[PDB]
PDB file of C-alpha atoms in Angstrom:
ATOM      1  CA  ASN A   1       0.070   0.120   0.146  1.00 41.02           C
ATOM      2  CA  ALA A   2       0.355   4.428  -0.263  1.00 39.56           C
ATOM      3  CA  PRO A   3       4.487   3.983  -1.243  1.00 39.27           C
ATOM      4  CA  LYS A   4       7.581   5.213   0.305  1.00 37.95           C
ATOM      5  CA  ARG A   5      10.007   7.037  -2.180  1.00 39.78           C
ATOM      6  CA  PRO A   6      12.424   4.905  -2.561  1.00 42.82           C
ATOM      7  CA  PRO A   7      16.435   6.272  -2.515  1.00 43.59           C
ATOM      8  CA  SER A   8      17.596   9.853  -4.554  1.00 46.52           C
ATOM      9  CA  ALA A   9      20.794   8.596  -4.950  1.00 42.92           C
ATOM     10  CA  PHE A  10      22.733  10.464  -1.703  1.00 43.04           C
ATOM     11  CA  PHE A  11      20.769   7.536  -0.189  1.00 43.91           C
ATOM     12  CA  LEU A  12      23.246   4.439  -1.189  1.00 45.54           C
ATOM     13  CA  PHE A  13      26.506   6.719  -0.406  1.00 46.29           C
ATOM     14  CA  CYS A  14      24.893   7.781   2.866  1.00 43.89           C
ATOM     15  CA  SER A  15      24.775   4.309   4.026  1.00 44.41           C
ATOM     16  CA  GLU A  16      27.984   3.325   2.610  1.00 45.98           C
ATOM     17  CA  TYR A  17      29.524   5.112   4.627  1.00 48.20           C
ATOM     18  CA  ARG A  18      27.804   6.580   7.582  1.00 49.40           C
ATOM     19  CA  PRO A  19      28.941   2.873   9.550  1.00 51.68           C
ATOM     20  CA  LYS A  20      32.806   3.430   8.621  1.00 54.87           C
ATOM     21  CA  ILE A  21      33.329   7.117   9.887  1.00 57.74           C
ATOM     22  CA  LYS A  22      31.012   6.872  12.528  1.00 56.11           C
ATOM     23  CA  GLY A  23      33.346   4.084  13.031  1.00 60.41           C
ATOM     24  CA  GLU A  24      36.146   6.908  13.405  1.00 60.78           C
ATOM     25  CA  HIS A  25      33.016   8.650  14.434  1.00 60.78           C
ATOM     26  CA  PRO A  26      31.634   7.040  18.114  1.00 59.80           C
ATOM     27  CA  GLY A  27      30.843  10.366  18.928  1.00 60.09           C
ATOM     28  CA  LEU A  28      28.556  11.545  16.276  1.00 57.44           C
ATOM     29  CA  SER A  29      24.909   9.973  15.640  1.00 61.69           C
ATOM     30  CA  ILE A  30      23.574   9.577  12.207  1.00 61.24           C
ATOM     31  CA  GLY A  31      22.439  13.027  11.854  1.00 61.47           C
ATOM     32  CA  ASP A  32      25.955  13.999  12.158  1.00 62.57           C
ATOM     33  CA  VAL A  33      27.241  11.278  10.890  1.00 59.00           C
ATOM     34  CA  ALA A  34      25.437  11.963   8.134  1.00 58.66           C
ATOM     35  CA  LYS A  35      25.604  15.246   8.389  1.00 58.28           C
ATOM     36  CA  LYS A  36      28.374  15.571   6.762  1.00 56.10           C
ATOM     37  CA  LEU A  37      27.546  13.274   4.163  1.00 50.49           C
ATOM     38  CA  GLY A  38      25.557  15.346   2.594  1.00 48.77           C
ATOM     39  CA  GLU A  39      28.087  17.445   2.159  1.00 48.17           C
ATOM     40  CA  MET A  40      30.279  15.341   0.565  1.00 48.68           C
ATOM     41  CA  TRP A  41      28.120  13.487  -1.529  1.00 46.51           C
ATOM     42  CA  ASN A  42      28.071  17.243  -3.581  1.00 47.79           C
ATOM     43  CA  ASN A  43      31.975  17.057  -2.955  1.00 45.35           C
ATOM     44  CA  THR A  44      32.339  13.728  -4.535  1.00 46.84           C
ATOM     45  CA  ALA A  45      33.188  12.791  -8.173  1.00 47.40           C
ATOM     46  CA  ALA A  46      29.470  13.162  -9.688  1.00 48.78           C
ATOM     47  CA  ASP A  47      30.903   9.906 -11.825  1.00 52.11           C
ATOM     48  CA  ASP A  48      30.680   8.421  -8.938  1.00 51.38           C
ATOM     49  CA  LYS A  49      27.257   9.012  -7.861  1.00 54.10           C
ATOM     50  CA  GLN A  50      25.790   7.986 -11.118  1.00 56.23           C
ATOM     51  CA  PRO A  51      26.337   4.167  -9.906  1.00 58.74           C
ATOM     52  CA  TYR A  52      24.586   5.406  -6.938  1.00 55.54           C
ATOM     53  CA  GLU A  53      21.985   7.621  -8.858  1.00 55.01           C
ATOM     54  CA  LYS A  54      20.866   4.806 -11.526  1.00 58.12           C
ATOM     55  CA  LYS A  55      19.529   2.941  -8.842  1.00 58.12           C
ATOM     56  CA  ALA A  56      18.193   5.648  -6.697  1.00 57.33           C
ATOM     57  CA  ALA A  57      15.831   6.461 -10.336  1.00 55.86           C
ATOM     58  CA  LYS A  58      15.021   2.408 -10.296  1.00 56.55           C
ATOM     59  CA  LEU A  59      13.902   2.553  -6.672  1.00 56.92           C
ATOM     60  CA  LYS A  60      11.692   5.675  -7.369  1.00 56.60           C
ATOM     61  CA  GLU A  61      10.710   5.192 -10.975  1.00 53.39           C
ATOM     62  CA  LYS A  62       9.242   1.375  -9.363  1.00 51.75           C
ATOM     63  CA  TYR A  63       7.542   3.553  -6.124  1.00 49.34           C
ATOM     64  CA  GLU A  64       5.519   6.192  -8.578  1.00 47.91           C
ATOM     65  CA  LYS A  65       4.054   3.217  -9.684  1.00 47.37           C
ATOM     66  CA  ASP A  66       2.920   1.942  -7.545  1.00 46.91           C
ATOM     67  CA  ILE A  67       1.615   4.600  -5.890  1.00 42.45           C
ATOM     68  CA  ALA A  68      -0.227   6.102  -9.031  1.00 41.49           C
ATOM     69  CA  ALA A  69      -1.639   2.872  -9.206  1.00 40.09           C
ATOM     70  CA  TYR A  70      -2.139   2.610  -5.034  1.00 40.14           C
ATOM     71  CA  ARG A  71      -3.663   6.796  -5.689  1.00 37.42           C
ATOM     72  CA  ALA A  72      -5.534   6.581  -8.954  1.00 37.73           C
ATOM     73  CA  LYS A  73      -7.269   3.286  -7.609  1.00 39.06           C
ATOM     74  CA  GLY A  74     -10.484   2.847  -5.244  1.00 41.41           C
ATOM     75  CA  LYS A  75     -11.513   4.998  -8.868  1.00 42.80           C
ATOM     76  CA  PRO A  76     -13.511   1.985 -10.973  1.00 43.47           C
ATOM     77  CA  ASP A  77     -15.872   0.705  -8.446  1.00 45.58           C
ATOM     78  CA  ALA A  78     -14.532  -1.907  -7.646  1.00 45.02           C
ATOM     79  CA  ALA A  79     -13.356  -4.948  -7.891  1.00 45.41           C
TER      80      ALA A  79
END
């Protein structure tokens, strides 16, 4: 039911590094170690984003369809 906006590119990268920086930063939270990612992502090589993006896209795409399929439903009336 009502899908939940999958990855957006950054999302991947985030995951990949969070536990690593945090590994060195057991003084941060998934709000600050994450904050860092938030920035680094823009500061990556926009060549290295490409992979994450293709994934994020595929994922949100799925959503947009199943969401549109769960948003534009209960209209035929509807069995």
